[PDB]
Symmetry: D2
Subunit: 307 residues, 4 copies
């Protein structure tokens, strides 16, 4: 009859028991059991905690008595945590992240409805093999493309060029797309038996950008640097000098964009690698994981075109 | 026939003379005069050159034989240069920035039509007193709201929540909005005689963001820091430590958002000021100009809600 | 505290007494001194011109009073853009007129109505809201009746103006105004319906491959005075549609070419018959054409209205 | 080089005149042009689209044809593209291309659009993705793409569904694969047909008239697509009109005039619902559905799967 869903809470203004007792209708959709993983605002989520989360989810999905998992998280960095598990979960079972833009105590709070939709999505057989998803505001987005585009609105999560995987209207799921990238069960990345991740920082691009910020990053032991550049990863003379110093020290430089959408195309005349359509936040996640398997720039560049 | 001066600063759209002769149709819309101001890619445009550009335009618009000015610029940082002039040009006469996403030698190059449209706008009497504008892909955008949203497409310039000031279809201008902010003739920012501006850097917000970046900035004498934060300017414990140190040293901290759109609301629990709806790039420009007149956080905050 | 009147016409947001609505969201009572009035109670798909005509007259009556600072009108979402644009052109006052609605029923989990209503009252009572034309408030956004339209059949963020943006937004209980529309409205509008009891008949026909000529004949047979064409692309017409439009013109009917696309400008074209709708979509175009026919039948004058309102 | 045939039907984008105008395409593939017709898309008719589909099926069956590019006007390309999306029985790429600015205009978009269409049609990674529309560096699916703006270059978009891929720097970046039935897995075949069932579209608005339904019924339509208010809502006059049609055996399909979104089922109302298909796309699927059956339950399932 009903599928077994585990609700793993990590924090956020949305929620775990109380949360569940707030919308009992979920009991009509599946057999739920809640587990408190942590309780912190997403702005304080760290790589080591995300790493533990990924490991815990792989453990649960290995069980025969678990059909899917729903994860409550804060909205601010959910695109970072979601993409990490998108690349590290070794199962076709549904992993759904859910969040809320208004606190549970607010008038017309969105959390209750988002949670109900998240459970319905995770328990549906149609949801298997689609990669990690983020459910909110009646939409279903892919971890690889979804990002928070507005600071304070309910409809903040969008993928302008890629669209949504599907939508939920009238308690029915309408799947529209399947992403054409590698993920989950077909990913080469595995963090089981790992307890630490390579250090990667992000530097911004703008008029008068300082070369000294690069010096500080290098001296503090970074293994990689993601550049949120102007336009299509364009670099000033000061940025070029800073990138050269990094390259001599064995640090991997990845050029992305501050614009918010689009493709950063390769350019033999500029230093570093290019991020494809990955934004700064997503690019950092993939670079950290890539560095746990290799340091060859040719191999890393290919990961960015396929993941 | 209106007298229009075309001031060239660089960009792939281009000297200024061969530019004008490459598209002779503009000669039928106005009596144009070209002037070479500089010639570099926009990623290398610096605050001191922009300061000089602003002063030169103020000089030109003061003459009775000049009805408007068109400035060719690279797309990558045009939103920075345009917003600077939006706040410093003391004239009612039209100032229009124009650019191109494809090189002049490209098949289906967009530069020729963009230039023709910019001249049409600068010469039209109904274009007076609307603030500095950016004309590209048949659209007219305000310097205060427009931004490059895509790394590589022709339709990259958009103001998702604010829309366009107007559009140009079939050689006719259709004006839709007037911005409800202060600019040009009613701005308090006077830059006559200045040779340099206060140093202001931008730091990114993400999972595991480091404290040492704030240290480096302070260590190098910055007078202000724009934070492109998570969500609505959220700050991690590490980011908060870095900010408190800057405030002690007397540095102004402005909290913005890395999301791309929306309002960052006030919050007494967090340190620093808030950017209203200005993105990181626009926020930096306003903060520098504010630092030329005051250091009182109360005054600066009001500037961000009215400009 | 401002004096605001809440006029209920229907919609899932409120069917229930307008008073029960106010008692349900008591917070509004701390933003202003509110008074409710039940004008009607029907789904917007059933709102008619004669009814919208009465609503306009009643609102002009209320705003003429010194003891009334603004009005909030609850309405269904489906045709609110039509009702809102009608008042946008006929209300002769600078006081705020704010339409509000809800995409989810009052009994739904995470219903949007309560917050939408609180935001509408805050907008209607703010002094900075005067002289901005009729507005539509929903999902933290403030949109102009002239540009706003329902763009999605079932989502909460359905109301948008893709090319024109929002007039402002409401975040953290604070209003942030961004634009002022550059079009004529309210106090500077020539349309005056006080004293009118009926409206000219205007129908809308769609443009698509294989479109039939007989739909034009049917409309003509039933005495329409105007026809709005939701055309392909920039108001393009097939050989069958042109034959239909020519028969209509021969019979005294005014033809207006708009677009089915959803956004943009339908530019002038002297090769084709009829007038053009500027950036007005089919629904908005029908409202302006009906009002225009109460004043004149001159094509040159009507065309000018479409470029200024 | 792959073998690509450019089939011209019209549009402001002499098929060989265009080929001589943009000779860059000969470095991308061995091209060959064919003049199928020459009319503005607003004048494209079902009988013509039927012949176009039969011709394309015929060409893609050959050993020496790797893909086909079709030049078309922008106004109804979404209608012609979706018709072929449902009737072409092959995995080989079928790409529709158009231009918003005249070939004589300054900064004309046609040359680049064509170059990108040929690149997409000749790439092996483009197989089995369904019929596509290429324009302004974007690759869109015929099932989701629509002309959203009357006159801009960036008019073709799929707000909720996004693009299949994008073309930047002479390289193709595929992003999605649609999750709907099409081409080789479609049950619609129009081989042998010379005519299609009559289907008309009626608009929903305040004061909508009942007599328009009577008119359609009088002229023998087999189906009616309703571009309704909101989620296919209907006024009392509309309900009266729909009831008359149903008792006469006419199939009523409720869609939406809004431009995007799902029209959910509601049995308190008359007729079927269009899922996420807009009015123009809905009429096309309904006509083809009527060549197989008149059963309401079956037609409704087609609308949830195609
Ligand atoms: N900064 C908080 C906001 C509340 C929320 O998004 O739930 C977080 O990201 O957790
Ligand atoms: N990075 C170059 C790109 C070319 C252009 O936008 O003109 C610039 O911003 O100048
Ligand atoms: N068709 C209903 C939907 C519910 C609503 O929008 O309030 C109406 O427009 O009244
Ligand atoms: N109405 C014309 C416009 C030109 C074009 O799109 O090519 C057509 O759709 O053919």
């Amino acid at each position: 009859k009903l599928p077994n869903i585990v609700i793993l809470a990590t924090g956020g203004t949305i929620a775990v028991d109380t949360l569940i007792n707030a919308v009992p209708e979920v009991k009509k959709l599946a057999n739920v059991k809640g587990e408190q993983f942590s309780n912190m605002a997403s702005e304080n989520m760290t790589g080591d905690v995300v790493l533990k989360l990924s490991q815990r989810v792989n453990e649960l999905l290995a069980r025969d008595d678990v059909d899917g998992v729903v994860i409550t998280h804060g909205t601010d960095t959910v695109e970072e945590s979601a993409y990490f598990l998108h690349l590290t979960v070794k199962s076709d079972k549904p992993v759904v992240f859910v969040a809320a833009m208004r606190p549970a105590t607010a008038i017309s709070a969105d959390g209750p409805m988002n949670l109900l939709e998240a459970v319905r999505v995770a328990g549906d057989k149609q949801s298997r093999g689609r990669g990690v998803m983020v459910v909110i505001n009646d939409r279903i987005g892919s971890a690889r493309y979804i990002t928070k585009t507005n600071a304070s609105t309910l409809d903040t999560f969008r993928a302008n060029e890629e669209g949504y995987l599907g939508v939920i209207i009238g308690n029915r799921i309408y799947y529209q797309n399947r992403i054409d990238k590698l993920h989950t069960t077909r990913s080469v990345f595995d963090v089981r038996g790992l307890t630490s991740l390579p250090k990667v920082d992000i530097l911004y691009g703008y008029q008068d950008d300082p070369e000294y910020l690069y010096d500080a990053a290098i001296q503090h032991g970074v293994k990689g640097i993601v550049y949120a550049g102007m336009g299509a990863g364009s670099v000033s003379v000061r940025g070029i000098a800073g990138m050269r110093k990094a390259l001599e020290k064995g640090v991997v430089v990845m050029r992305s964009t501050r614009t918010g959408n689009g493709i950063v195309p390769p350019d033999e005349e500029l230093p570093g690698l290019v991020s494809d359509s990955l934004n700064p936040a997503h690019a950092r996640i993939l670079l950290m994981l890539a560095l746990t398997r290799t340091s060859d720039p040719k191999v890393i560049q290919e990961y960015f075109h396929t993941y």
